[PDB]
Amino acid sequence: MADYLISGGTSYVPDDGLTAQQLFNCGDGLTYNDFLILPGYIDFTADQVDLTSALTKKITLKTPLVSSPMDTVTEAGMAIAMALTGGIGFIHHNCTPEFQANEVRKVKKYYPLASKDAKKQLLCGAAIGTHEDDKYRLDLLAQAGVDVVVLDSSQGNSIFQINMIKYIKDKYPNLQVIGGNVVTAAQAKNLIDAGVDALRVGMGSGSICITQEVLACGRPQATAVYKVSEYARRFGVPVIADGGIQNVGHIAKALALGASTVMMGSLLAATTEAPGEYFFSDGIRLKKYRGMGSLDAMIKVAQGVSGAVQDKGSIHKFVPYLIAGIQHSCQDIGAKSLTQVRAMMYSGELKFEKRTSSAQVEGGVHSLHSYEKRLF
Amino acid sequence: MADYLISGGTSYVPDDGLTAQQLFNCGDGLTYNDFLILPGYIDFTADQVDLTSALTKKITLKTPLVSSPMDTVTEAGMAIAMALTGGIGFIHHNCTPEFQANEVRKVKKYYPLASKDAKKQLLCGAAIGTHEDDKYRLDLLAQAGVDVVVLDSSQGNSIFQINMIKYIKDKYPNLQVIGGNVVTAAQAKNLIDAGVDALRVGMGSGSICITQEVLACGRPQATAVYKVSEYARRFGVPVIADGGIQNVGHIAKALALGASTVMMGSLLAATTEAPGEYFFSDGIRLKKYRGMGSLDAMIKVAQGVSGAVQDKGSIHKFVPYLIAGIQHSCQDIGAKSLTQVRAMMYSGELKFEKRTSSAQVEGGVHSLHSYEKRLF
Amino acid sequence: MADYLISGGTSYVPDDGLTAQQLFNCGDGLTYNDFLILPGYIDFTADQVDLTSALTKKITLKTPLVSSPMDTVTEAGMAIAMALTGGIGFIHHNCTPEFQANEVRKVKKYYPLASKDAKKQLLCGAAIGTHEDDKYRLDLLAQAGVDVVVLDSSQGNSIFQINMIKYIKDKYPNLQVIGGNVVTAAQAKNLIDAGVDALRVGMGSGSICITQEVLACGRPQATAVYKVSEYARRFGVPVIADGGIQNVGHIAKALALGASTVMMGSLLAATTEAPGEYFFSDGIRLKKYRGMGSLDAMIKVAQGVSGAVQDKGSIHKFVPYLIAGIQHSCQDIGAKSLTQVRAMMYSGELKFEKRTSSAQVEGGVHSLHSYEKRLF
Amino acid sequence: MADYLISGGTSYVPDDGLTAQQLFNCGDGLTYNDFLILPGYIDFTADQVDLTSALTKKITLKTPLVSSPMDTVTEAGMAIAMALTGGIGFIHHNCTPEFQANEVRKVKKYYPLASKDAKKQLLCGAAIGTHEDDKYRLDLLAQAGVDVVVLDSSQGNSIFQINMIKYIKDKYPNLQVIGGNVVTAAQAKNLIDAGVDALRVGMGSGSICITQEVLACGRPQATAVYKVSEYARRFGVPVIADGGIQNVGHIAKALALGASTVMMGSLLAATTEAPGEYFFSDGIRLKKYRGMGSLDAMIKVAQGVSGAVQDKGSIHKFVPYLIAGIQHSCQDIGAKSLTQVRAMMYSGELKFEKRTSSAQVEGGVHSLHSYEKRLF
Amino acid sequence: MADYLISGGTSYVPDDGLTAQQLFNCGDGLTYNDFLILPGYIDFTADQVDLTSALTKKITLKTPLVSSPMDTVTEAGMAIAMALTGGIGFIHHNCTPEFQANEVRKVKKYYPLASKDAKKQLLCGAAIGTHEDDKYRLDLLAQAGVDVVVLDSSQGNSIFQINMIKYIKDKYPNLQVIGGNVVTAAQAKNLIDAGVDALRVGMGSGSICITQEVLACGRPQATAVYKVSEYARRFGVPVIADGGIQNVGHIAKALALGASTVMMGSLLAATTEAPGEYFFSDGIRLKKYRGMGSLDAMIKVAQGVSGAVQDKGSIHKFVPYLIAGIQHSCQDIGAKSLTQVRAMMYSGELKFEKRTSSAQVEGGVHSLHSYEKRLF
Numbered sequence A, B, C, D, E: 001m002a003d004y005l006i007s008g009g010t011s012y013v014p015d016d017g018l019t020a021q022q023l024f025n026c027g028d029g030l031t032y033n034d035f036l037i038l039p040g041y042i043d044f045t046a047d048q049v050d051l052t053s054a055l056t057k058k059i060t061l062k063t064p065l066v067s068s069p070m071d072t073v074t075e076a077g078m079a080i081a082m083a084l085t086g087g088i089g090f091i092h093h094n095c096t097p098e099f100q101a102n103e104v105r106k107v108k109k110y111y112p113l114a115s116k117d118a119k120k121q122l123l124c125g126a127a128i129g130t131h132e133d134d135k136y137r138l139d140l141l142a143q144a145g146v147d148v149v150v151l152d153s154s155q156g157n158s159i160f161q162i163n164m165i166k167y168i169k170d171k172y173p174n175l176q177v178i179g180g181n182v183v184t185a186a187q188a189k190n191l192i193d194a195g196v197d198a199l200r201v202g203m204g205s206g207s208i209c210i211t212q213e214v215l216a217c218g219r220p221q222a223t224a225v226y227k228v229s230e231y232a233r234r235f236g237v238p239v240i241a242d243g244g245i246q247n248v249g250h251i252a253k254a255l256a257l258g259a260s261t262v263m264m265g266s267l268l269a270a271t272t273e274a275p276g277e278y279f280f281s282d283g284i285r286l287k288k289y290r291g292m293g294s295l296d297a298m299i300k301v302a303q304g305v306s307g308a309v310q311d312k313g314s315i316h317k318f319v320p321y322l323i324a325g326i327q328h329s330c331q332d333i334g335a336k337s338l339t340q341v342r343a344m345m346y347s348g349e350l351k352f353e354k355r356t357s358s359a360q361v362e363g364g365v366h367s368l369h370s371y372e373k374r375l376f
């Protein structure tokens, strides 16, 4: 009868809010702090939220948390410790190729959901450049048995990177490539048609990044993630959001805008497994953290600063906190998996809301004298 | 003749400003500080402004000021002292059920407009969770004679809370329930159809709240109050605005956007009747005030911080100041009652105006070296 | 309790449609056939709809139907017969002043609601031009005892008509003037500030009018009526909609857009009381009907054509049909009086809807071979 | 005091309507029948409206009415009779060059405002093509003493016409050229920079024109006149509106949109001075009138039809009717000259209003059985 | 076949972002920090980016970096040192005319791309006012052999500056003039029609400028550069962006919005070649830098402040850093020259994106305790 025959059994669900297509096609460029996700319906607890995410077209991870190929973020210690907690690590290329191959064979010769391949060894990634001298680095890393390579450049739509991708896709046919950095859909077109397996989205949004203030180029991070994800889902290519991630909420928004995995350099810096040693400044324990374009890491123009960030403990205590935060955020969204989050987003069911500056002020902590924030 | 026959006796009234439907349907999310109310016509003094507001569908209060169920806001002292000044108090559930039932029978076994029931006892409320173990807490509070229960959760549209509401509405048919927290109209649909008697509007806008910065979810408070109030007036269900209230102007804007009562945790914290004891920090007398999701009040994710706020004296001196502020704001609006304020708002007679950031700068205090603000 | 305290007793009333301010401020120029009125609530029968309308600032009629000062519409027969049925008649000036004064004293020396003055004589109007020779015509009509004069010109915002209005308002202080024709608000400003008592709205919308196709000037009739009525209600000045009226629905739309009375030349032509004699053409009984600017009624440029329209019987059988049609249209609107219609329109309660061309096709008669329409 | 010191003496003038910049920048393409001019203030009679208009940058006419270079519109009879009534005539080029030079010396060897040069001879124009064989025609017309040449082509932005303009502007330095046809501003840029003295606006809007229905190109006439006039006033170049003119109102709208003179082929066809002879069809006296692109006037593609139009008498009786119509339309606009009309239009003082289809129906003649229209 | 015949060989290029016409015609006024440039395709290294830019209509520079005529920015040391690195220097007029002529002959009597004239001497510029006493200064500078003069005023659209330009363009026919300051297109019209050779864009955007906070006039800098450049390219007149430049990214955005050269006062102040001497304040080596309207540099109203800025070393080490930054920014844009940057911008190929305030926060450095930024 008429309880089913009118609308086909689906309930009313009063329309309130904006979809992702109605929000990011206004022409205005939004970052992570400029919007928020409207909540929905819960019929499940937070611990049964599946976090299975695809790194590349054939590599599948158990947590959507990858780590950045920087000289003060990841080496083989972080490549082990991110893999054991579900993610993957990318070992930087600010070193000799023998050293980087040593780090890749150090992680490869090494926990319930530990992201391991068919030979029961830990997954690893490594960064290479697009210069002709890096083909020897690629050969020496592929002899070490690297599973995925990322082509590290701040501007990914070059002829050099397209020729390097077409070199890898026939010299090493079982090796996965990650192209980047891209922020528009035309760059995603030029790299997907070259045969890339994943994209790396974000230019000018890093915490150690002065590309927008020296080279005047890039775009805001949330709009970048949405515009490259909406193009890259046409061909079945995952993207990787790097830059702009400051907390768990930015990770949840990046995963809800279409990014399959999230790359973190500063939120994972000054951890126990990050390379370097601790020191003190104004009575605060903190580890050094510099960008790859900074002149302390290289006429040379600097695209990075050389700073420091406070200690965050160990990473087997920090990554499960990020896991539980993403699970509680997917509970408040109302979806049992990240695939369901993105499926609700592209179908128009998952809705958003733009946020002004004084509504960003109330979104944090206000109206207090002094607070003692303990995340975990 | 033509002085009456043209427009039916109603005057010209030049159209200037935006109605609430024209302001909160622009897609952009506004908070309390992003707009202001345009004034009207006065033919009445401020002392004859009636402040009668409905808490639930059958509980009627004399002042639109309810107090928050937090462990550093309300216990039976605040539940007495908010009831005697016209409002009501909600006793927190961060304790054993025998302790909470003791506080409810302490306020129940206890001034011209003192909000009292048919047995001339003081009105009281109590918070319960939605877990199965809280049915025993509900039974032990209903034996103490609680008049209204609020189902305390940061996300109110769950199957657990709907089953708890359908459990209360047939086991205790004369007990009023308050569902929350809701921010959209679909959640108000799922809770009103479950049989709720009032709603509790606001997610991510508290002063001790980091839900938007960890779980990436919620919406700005003023848009939330308007969108849930405009849906909940279709069924005769009052809503309760909590979060974001910093002063008397936010209370007046929340009551003008459709909220029947306003819930305050931080503006009533560090009062004399609030639980805890005073201490000093940098020569400032202040009382501790933490959120319910903070790890000092509970892998566990934290949705709250643990801070402190300065002393505000007693509450029989502070709530009449809020009463006089709401009355003077309803005088400048031009309405003799809050029902007339909301009736002017939904009819399009009461008009609003959006406010930029530098017009928020001029709205406060500027152009001075140092000022000594004394509210009361 | 909460059934009254939320919205002040006023019901929900789901918002659907456009107000008159939202419809006629789109920039596009609408006529009578380009929109329609959305219906409302009925708690009254059609026979108790009061049709009291103000002609000028001191003349009050019982029906909102005045008749046009044309040489084939009104003489003293129509000035009697429109007055006896509630309206008023305006006697044309296409004659010698002694003849027009004879017609005014013929109607003045002449039924339940018969529109009569303090001396129990029938109300009458007369048209004069703005030339200096028409002051003698004005004196000879005011000796006959005319109650209201209309200053007949297709363009009312001239220095000649303003000087004539300032001549009448001090030589004849108890004589009501009607200025016109006006279509914009600036012309209404220049004539109301001159001291006019009513306006006459419409330029280029008559059925015998080629002003828009020769002099390229005017505006559509419904937008003209709304824009002059919304300005003229600021000063308590009624307006008169002439031109474009083809049926009862155009009269109802003109009265709902702010016009106090409606002037009809072609819908009242070829009546029994209209001057002239009948003849036949293709076996159809029809009376001649020409405009005042036509060269058969006057290098001279023609602003009118000289046509003919079919017989409509007597006018004591035709005006009560218009009365019953306006009453049934005010019943479907939901207002017991025209003052209530305009009060609902300016308050935003009475709503409109724009209508496309194929929705104008379905609004009439379609899908039939041949029909026999009998209005009365 | 404050009657002058507030607004500088200028009155209020309530803003109502759209300017020409707000009307023709909506993206939608409007013709003459899609809009109308809003009236203003009169302090002058119609007979003192000055109609002085500039044909080219140095030729000044007394009436803004030029006549079209077509083989059934103008020869030396029309070139005499349009010049004597204030305008100018353009003699067609559908003939041998000796014949066209004979017609130019026939008009040159020939009344209060008769448009005559320094030698007291009548002004004349002649059309030439852009082919290389037409340089001999240009030489044979300049020996006859032609005052202005129009370069007749349906598409004026060619390299052929630009080379012909640069040929005339140095071989004949005192000869005025008129380029066309142009409809966009880029074509006006390419022809004004070539050194043209006037433009000829309109492509696809003639009554005998099927360019839009065969070659799919052009634009609506009113938008074309506005967009080329607003560009050509930057350099002091008049434009000439041809095509789409059906009555006096289209001439008044074309002069109010920025055109200095108006070119008419069909409204001046079947006059006594037009070439050809009369005949009868269905008892109607009418003269043949074909376009220049029609195959009866020439694989050849046809851009014209070969029709006929009814007799309009003599042209010394018809052009003063157009003069009086333009003067009465400039009276209802409120400007004493065409320069004042265009100055009010570009300043935003003269306002317009868009017109729907059913408001085009009421703008003509409706609601009649049959009418006898006599224009003059 | 169909790989070429569909779209003419040009690739798909998915449309994403806003053009400069779609960004700066929204009505809202944008500065340099309110937008950013979307990147494109690279097929070239950064060192082969040509930086040839036109100062005036006949002076051509090798780097788009000119220096400001201020008393603490440029004298003959800076006029030498900016010319040797490719740019040009403008010597201030806050001195006697003999002193300024001495500085011009000091630079004129003085490295691979060194911007030198036909006599192999260094290019130089000098500022003059618009007063009548400055004609003697102009004569004494033209005897020294100045190549270009800038008419220094904060408001360039005066009768004084137009008469001075018409004085220079006939007394000194081979001398190039630069008019300014202009921000709108009407001022560019009044100065280009006076015969100016270059424009100087910017009013109220200097770092030492309080014109917008005292005289309430000007416009934001990026919108000013775009609106004057889009008008001045119609006549082949370069413009000069001064004010608002803080880093290399502002120079790249100014060159991408249509400015041919960029003028810098504060970014070149406290260099070794800037006039003045160093001192210390709070242990920081810094040189004094005041505006020309400041009362320390002159009832007189002040349009400037008198501050100081930190040391930047030498300018043969600083200008090649700006060169390499502009080259890397033109690499990320995807154009091999500044002419190609502006050609991609006006064709709609080069696209932009608006940037919010919290996306300006992420564009710089965030999420760090303290950083050590080393640009070069």
Ligand SMILES: O=c1[nH]cnc2c1ncn2[C@@H]1O[C@H](COP(=O)(O)O)[C@@H](O)[C@H]1O
Pocket: A068, A069, A070, A154, A181, A202, A204, A205, A206, A207, A208, A209, A210, A211, A242, A243, A244, A245, A263, A264, A265, A266, A267, A290, A291, A292, A293, A294, A303, A304, A305, E367
């Ligand atoms: O030196 C640099 N200049 C510009 N971007 C960088 C640099 N170093 C790292 N990045 C990017 O910034 C990301 C990490 O930044 P985060 O947001 O602070 O974690 C990395 O994934 C890179 O994509």
Ligand SMILES: O=c1[nH]cnc2c1ncn2[C@@H]1O[C@H](COP(=O)(O)O)[C@@H](O)[C@H]1O
Pocket: A367, B068, B069, B070, B154, B181, B202, B204, B205, B206, B207, B208, B209, B210, B211, B242, B243, B244, B245, B263, B264, B265, B266, B267, B290, B291, B292, B293, B294, B303, B304, B305
């Ligand atoms: O720990 C928490 N996490 C998130 N929201 C909270 C928490 N504790 C209290 N709240 C909410 O914040 C309100 C009071 O916040 P206030 O605006 O600072 O008064 C309460 O009514 C609750 O709805």
Ligand SMILES: O=c1[nH]cnc2c1ncn2[C@@H]1O[C@H](COP(=O)(O)O)[C@@H](O)[C@H]1O
Pocket: C068, C069, C070, C154, C181, C202, C204, C205, C206, C207, C208, C209, C210, C211, C242, C243, C244, C245, C263, C264, C265, C266, C267, C290, C291, C292, C293, C294, C303, C304, C305, D367
């Ligand atoms: O000759 C004319 N030219 C232009 N308008 C006219 C003329 N004669 C009458 N009118 C107007 O047209 C109205 C009647 O036209 P109707 O709409 O056909 O009834 C009169 O009230 C006048 O305002």
Ligand SMILES: O=c1[nH]cnc2c1ncn2[C@@H]1O[C@H](COP(=O)(O)O)[C@@H](O)[C@H]1O
Pocket: D068, D069, D070, D154, D181, D202, D204, D205, D206, D207, D208, D209, D210, D211, D242, D243, D244, D245, D263, D264, D265, D266, D267, D290, D291, D292, D293, D294, D303, D304, D305
């Ligand atoms: O054969 C033709 N094909 C297309 N346009 C024509 C042709 N002949 C004349 N025209 C144009 O149409 C105008 C006259 O058309 P009218 O509007 O009917 O007067 C002339 O001024 C020409 O610009």
Ligand SMILES: O=c1[nH]cnc2c1ncn2[C@@H]1O[C@H](COP(=O)(O)O)[C@@H](O)[C@H]1O
Pocket: E068, E069, E070, E154, E181, E202, E204, E205, E206, E207, E208, E209, E210, E211, E242, E243, E244, E245, E263, E264, E265, E266, E267, E290, E291, E292, E293, E294, E303, E304, E305
């Ligand atoms: O005193 C002043 N008042 C207003 N503008 C000034 C003044 N002095 C210099 N300027 C302008 O500011 C520019 C340099 O400012 P900067 O952006 O701080 O480099 C110069 O090119 C001038 O156009």
